[PDB]
Amino acid sequence: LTTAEYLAYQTERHVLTILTDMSSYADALREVSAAREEVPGRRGYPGYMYTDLSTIYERAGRVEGRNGSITQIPILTMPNDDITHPIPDLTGYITEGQIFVDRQLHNKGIYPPINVLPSLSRLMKSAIGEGMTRKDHGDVSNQLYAKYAIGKDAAAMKAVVGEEALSIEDKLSLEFLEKFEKTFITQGAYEDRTVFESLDQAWSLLRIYPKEMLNRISPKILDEFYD
């Protein structure tokens, strides 16, 4: 943290922070808190853990008058596959947005298993748009997410009455879900694709549906993007 701090306020350069296995650092912090021989709190964790994380995640931000900014994206293992975990509950109200992992998508032999429902970012408003990322970013993101969600609802509905009862939006969401899951979701091990490749693959994959099949799209966007 001090290392990232030196490259921002002093050296003035763009920095990115990444923490791995925060759960082990939490158990370590538990042994360290028990080093004061204090009676532990709920589920064997210090009551000052809120402040312990508050002196950690507060190391990220942009400084006024300084060109160099430091950004942090920590990683933590949720206990026993539970979101009720003290770690998740502590980073939940503190950090902005959360990127989870779907055990279903990891055990199905597919790529990166971030559940589309759970995936969110609070700074997503400032990181997209014309001049930031792309004008096709937010609207198509919401459209693809809605396609995956409605696609899941249709996945359950088709698992009920069958595929003979598939409706227009239902079948459209079925193809959209199958595609988004086996393609959009698929990225790579070392593979890094550009934002332009993301917007293009998004418009192209969402092109499977008609122009009026997406109520999540704006007219100006649809006229200046789809081609």
Told to check if 83 binds other proteins by CB under 8 A, we report: no
Joined tokens for residue 40? 């532990």
207 known ligand binder: no
CB of 160 to other proteins, least distance (A): 5
- Decide if residue 160 touches other proteins (CB under 8 A): yes
Side-chain-side CA neighbours of residue 15 (13 Å): 26
Helix (H) or strand (E) holding 17: strand 15-17
Distance, in Å, from the CA atom of 174 to the CA atom of 181, rounded to the nearest integer, reads 10
Q: Smallest distance from the beta carbon of 70 to other proteins, in angstroms?
A: 39
Shortest distance in whole angstroms from residue 211 CB to other proteins: 8
Please give the C-alpha separations between residue 217 and each of 91, 194, 220, in angstroms, as whole numbers. 33, 22, 9
The residues, any chain, with a CB within 8 Å of residue 40's CB and separated by 6 or more, are 30, 33, 34, 46
Q: How many residues contact other proteins, by CB under 8 A? A: 18
Judged by CB under 8 A, the stretch of 6-14, 89-97, 165-173, 180-188 that binds other proteins is 165-173
Q: What distance in Å separates the CA atoms of residue 17 and residue 111, rounded to the nearest whole number?
A: 24
In this structure, the dihedral spanned by the alpha carbons of residues 81, 87, 88 and 89, taken in order and rounded to 10 degrees, is 130
Closer residue to other proteins, CB minimum distance, 35 or 189: 35
Tokens of 103: 């055990």
Structure tokens at 71: 């950004």
213 lies in the site for other proteins, by CB under 8 A:
yes
Q: Choose, by CB under 8 A, the member of 11, 167, 201, 218 that binds other proteins.
A: 167
Choosing from 97, 161, 197, 201, the residue that interacts with other proteins (CB under 8 A) is: 161
DSSP state of 72: E
Name the minimum Å distance from CB 197 to other proteins.
Answer: 27
Nearer to other proteins, 7 or 213 (CB): 213
User: Where are the extended beta strands (E) located within the chain?
Assistant: 15-17, 70-72
- Span of 28-36, 125-133, 139-147, 164-172 interacting with other proteins by CB under 8 A: 164-172
Among the listed residues 37, 130, 191, 212, the single contact to other proteins using CB under 8 A? 212
d(CA 109, CA 92): 29
By CB under 8 A, residue 210 contacts other proteins = yes
Binding mask 23-62 for other proteins (x = CB under 8 A): ----------------xxxx--------------------
Residues lying near other proteins in the complex (CB under 8 A) are found at 39-42, 156-157, 160-161, 164-165, 167-169, 171, 210, 212-213, 215
Annotated binding-site residues for ATP read 122
